[PDB]
Design a protein around this ligand. Structure first.
Ligand code: HEC
Ligand SMILES: [Cu+2]
Lengths: 105, 254
């Protein structure tokens, strides 16, 4: 469901904790721009079982989220089996700001 | 973006030529302004206001080919000792002027260099940087004297990535002399794949440059073309500018 991904663990570092969110087929989780911004995430049409963006595209977000203290949400279909729908913090892509949504299956 | 400049020039944003690394990739040149108070007293907050104007009606090619408005960013270089003012010292009148921007230091060590961006330009053509003035009594190396303040102000997309690849906000020159034997705009997903070939009749060789979505052609089939000639218009409607101001850290007495 709509859970919060604190894009750079607010009083911690520029990371995606707890990195492996094992969500369910749908989960309207949000990406939250807490500090050192912005954080937008494209979706892995590269790193995952169903690396098929067309499934929704909304899945793969992007373009500088200048939301000082606010979040954006990414919903799935119900037709989401064994999926590691990995997400990208674009201007940070590598500094441990990468996450792997794991829809059970 | 400022962030690439941070990632690969932490101690050389003002190249020894006096030019700022933004120029390296944001190639076009457009004006940037900066007003700064004539003088300031130790340990007081003041505002270095920077302007990065441009005809707002213009539009630029986005990364995907569609056309969209521009965003803005900047680098402000202060002397050592000077630094972003903390929140408690920013009064409310100044606080509303800054909106809700987030100044980052260029590097944790470089407190005196302060960046911002990308942010929409419609909202932030002008930017107000709070700055706490230092105190010689509590800082021996700092003194009551004139001081320079350089600035860089960008608008719109640049032409080259840190890897050296071109972006689709730039001129695609020919990589060949020759005649053009075939052309075809095709549609892919976000935007057109432009396709073409050149016959280097001189060297008896064929090549197939490729042009991304967003630009639009000058040349046609069967036209003689020279190496390095402009195949497309230049779609860059943004650019980069820089200037400096002087500031007098002033003794309370005279
Ligand atoms: C080595 C590369 C490089 C450097 C250095 C660089 N930029 Fe950029 N910049 C680019 C490119 C390429 C883009 C286009 C990115 C894209 O496709 O969205 C861009 C885009 C931007 C944008 C967003 C424009 C928009 O509308 O989307 C701003 C603002 C910007 N740069 C500011 C700056 C400032 C200020 C600095 C440095 C203090 C800087 N840049 C340095 C390459 C650079
Ligand atoms: Cu981030």
């Amino acid at each position: 469901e709509t859970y919060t991904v604190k894009l750079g663990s607010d009083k911690g570092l520029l990371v995606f904790e707890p990195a492996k969110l094992t969500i369910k087929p749908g989960d309207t989780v949000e990406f939250l721009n807490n500090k050192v911004p912005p954080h937008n995430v494209v979706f892995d049409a590269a790193l995952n079982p169903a690396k098929s963006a067309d499934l929704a595209k909304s899945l793969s977000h992007k373009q500088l989220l200048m939301s000082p203290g606010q979040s954006t949400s990414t919903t799935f279909p119900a037709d989401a089996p064994a999926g590691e729908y990995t997400f990208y913090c674009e201007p940070h892509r590598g500094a441990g700001m990468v996450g792997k949504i794991t829809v059970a299956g | 973006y400022p962030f690439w400049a941070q990632q690969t020039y932490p101690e050389t944003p003002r190249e020894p030529t006096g030019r700022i690394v933004c120029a390296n990739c944001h190639l076009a040149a457009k004006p940037t302004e900066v007003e700064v108070p004539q003088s300031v007293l130790p340990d007081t907050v003041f505002k270095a206001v920077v302007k990065i104007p441009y005809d707002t009606s213009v539009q630029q090619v986005g990364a995907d080919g569609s056309k969209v408005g521009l965003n803005v960013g900047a680098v402000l270089m202060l002397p050592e000792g000077f630094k972003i003012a903390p929140e408690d010292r920013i009064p409310e009148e100044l606080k509303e002027e800054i909106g809700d921007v987030y100044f980052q230091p260029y590097g944790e060590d470089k407190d005196n260099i302060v960046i911002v961006g990308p942010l929409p330009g419609e909202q932030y053509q002008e930017i107000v940087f709070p700055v706490l003035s230092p105190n010689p009594a509590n800082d021996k190396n700092i003194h009551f004297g004139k001081y320079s303040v350089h600035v860089g102000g960008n608008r719109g997309r640049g032409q080259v990535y840190p890897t050296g690849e071109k972006s689709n906000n730039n001129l695609y020159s020919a990589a060949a002399t020759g005649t053009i034997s075939k052309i075809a705009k095709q549609e892919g997903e976000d935007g057109s794949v432009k396709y073409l070939v050149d016959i280097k009749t001189e060297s008896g060789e064929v090549v197939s440059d490729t042009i991304p979505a967003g630009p639009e052609l000058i040349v046609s089939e069967g036209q003689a073309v020279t190496a390095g000639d402009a195949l497309t218009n230049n779609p860059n409607v943004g650019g980069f500018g820089q200037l400096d101001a002087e500031i007098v850290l002033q003794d309370a007495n005279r």
